[PDB]
């Protein structure tokens, strides 16, 4: 149906916007602390601590399968990256401080992305 096609064009346009949001978010992580999943080989207890691991590469895989239906979903995943790190790591660590900085800087990007998703529909 043409209705299905038009919904598909909307998903694709969201996907394009979310890809640019994602690159912008990731540039706020120049150390690449959140680039890849936490290794179970190197933190074998990780899943006893964190129930829903997230990282930028896993978000990117989801994105390219057009697996985000709206911005809320994408923000949930971004928030998990931050929130996992701030629980697993202590305040005085490079990991925790990198999360704080990503959150603060990413907040600006998301503030305007929410306007762009509303605005362009």
Q: Structure tokens of 113?
A: 């992305």
Q: For the chain, what are the domain ranges?
A: 1-121
> Cβ neighbours of residue 22 under 8 Å, at least 6 residues apart?
56, 59, 60, 63, 74
The data reach a resolution, in angstroms, of 2.0
Selection from 4, 9, 5, 22 nearest residue 71 by Cα: 22
Query: 């006893």: which residue's tokens?
Result: 48
Return the residue matching tokens 């990198």. Answer: 98
Angle at 41 between CA 39 and CA 44, to 5 degrees: 90
**Sign of the CA dihedral running 21, 97, 84, 45:** positive
CATH of 1-121, one of 2.60.40.10, 1.20.920.10, 3.30.70.990, 3.10.28.10: 1.20.920.10
Experimental method of this PDB entry: X-ray
The single-letter DSSP state of residue 105 is H
């Amino acid at each position: 149906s043409m209705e299905q096609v038009a919904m598909e064009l909307r998903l694709t346009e969201l996907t394009r916007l979310l890809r640019s949001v994602l690159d912008q978010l990731q540039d706020k992580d120049p150390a690449r602390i959140f680039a890849q999943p936490v290794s179970l080989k190197e933190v074998p207890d990780y899943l006893d601590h964190i129930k829903h691991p997230m990282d930028f590469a896993t978000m990117r895989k989801r994105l390219e399968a057009q697996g985000y239906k709206n911005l809320h979903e994408f923000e949930e995943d971004f928030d998990l990256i931050i929130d996992n790190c701030m629980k697993y790591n202590a305040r005085d660590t490079v990991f925790y401080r990198a999360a704080v900085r990503l959150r603060d800087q990413g907040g600006v990007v998301l503030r305007q992305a929410r306007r762009e998703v509303d605005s362009i529909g």
